[PDB]
Amino acid sequence: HSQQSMVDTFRASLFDNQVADQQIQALPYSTMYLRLNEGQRIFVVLGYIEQEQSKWLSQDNAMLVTHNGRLLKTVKLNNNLLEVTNSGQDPLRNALAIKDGSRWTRDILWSEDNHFRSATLSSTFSFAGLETLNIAGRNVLCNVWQEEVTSTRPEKQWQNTFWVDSATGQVRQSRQMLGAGVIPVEMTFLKPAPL
Amino acid sequence: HSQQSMVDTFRASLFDNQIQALPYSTMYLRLNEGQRIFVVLGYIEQEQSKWLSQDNAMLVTHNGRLLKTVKLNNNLLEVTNSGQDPLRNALAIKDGSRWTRDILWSEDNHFRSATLSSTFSFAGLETLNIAGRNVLCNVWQEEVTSTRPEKQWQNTFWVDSATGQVRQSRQMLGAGVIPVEMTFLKPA
DSSP states (O other): OOOOOHHHHHHHHHHHOOOOHHHHTTOSSOEEEEEETTOOOEEEEEEEEETTEEEEEOTTOOEEEEETTEEEEEESSSSOEEEESSGGGOGGGGGGGOOTTOEEEEEEEEEETTEEEEEEEEEEEEEEEEEEEEETTEEEEEEEEEEEEEETTTTEEEEEEEEEETTTOOEEEEEEESSSSOSEEEEEEOSOOOO | OOOOOHHHHHHHHHTSOOOOOOSSOEEEEEETTOOEEEEEEEEEETTEEEEEETTTEEEEEETTEEEEEESSSSOEEEESOGGGOGGGGGGGOOTTOEEEEEEEEEETTEEEEEEEEEEEEEEEEEEEEETTEEEEEEEEEEEEEETTTTEEEEEEEEEETTTOOEEEEEEESSSSOSEEEEEEEOOO
């Protein structure tokens, strides 16, 4: 037997009746532009939130789990992020209160070619300045934060970038790896949050 | 900073202020044998069905089995060994099936817990009339017993004879307490 949920029904309709710059601002719910491996941009919608975790759904019904631009888990993709520990200590949890020099240590678990990998990541946030981004035809002033990350065994280091709304703290754009310095992910959050 | 999810929008469209015949699964919910409440299926994850109810309430189930509740007066916080519940394969159920698990719920702001043991026993064939459509079901009675304090009760589940899907269930939110009646309406 099979049931029909509202999320599936209205999600299908969205992709069956579709991006228009005016239609984006007309969508009542949050949406995002996803880019994997510098690949092609795909449209994702925010289906629901559980324990401060935002679950975004694509057309192929793949799922992305995040918290204020930070990627915490993925489902139904070629390669998936399986876990991120000590996520409650991520500075992005209070993006406006991030001080230059913020640090964070956690471990991640991700699959690569159906093989499980993991590593210990330590990073520091560095204020890169102010920047205005145009998203869905609107301007947004962002505090640009550059996260210098270093993992070990093997020793690797890369940089993630997070564009924060200087008034709400909401991340409007982010660039990060899905694993330890591997599988770049780009996300642009279209629906702006008010004060 | 806040976000707008599709569930938030569905809620604003249905409960934000006080229908029928919709393109998705729905359900008639009845608590403590009170008034019938209209519930809808919001989404599914990990084989769990998350229903949406008024006042930001939520009910999680799996083929007729209540597995959790949110934002209600008294909530079912957890049920273990769910993958072993016979309802998982309602058609493969023989008169005398058993199941053991622990439940966690909250009564009048107090948190309680208990280990449950039950056995299924056939109660006869029955035709249910749901949404003007007849449906032949295998009525399954479930004798559940616990201890400290000792207590037992009966759960009744209506399994579609051919589909194996529960279309109506009657059970307790907690140990022998808080009756929950659910009638599942197909999308059509």
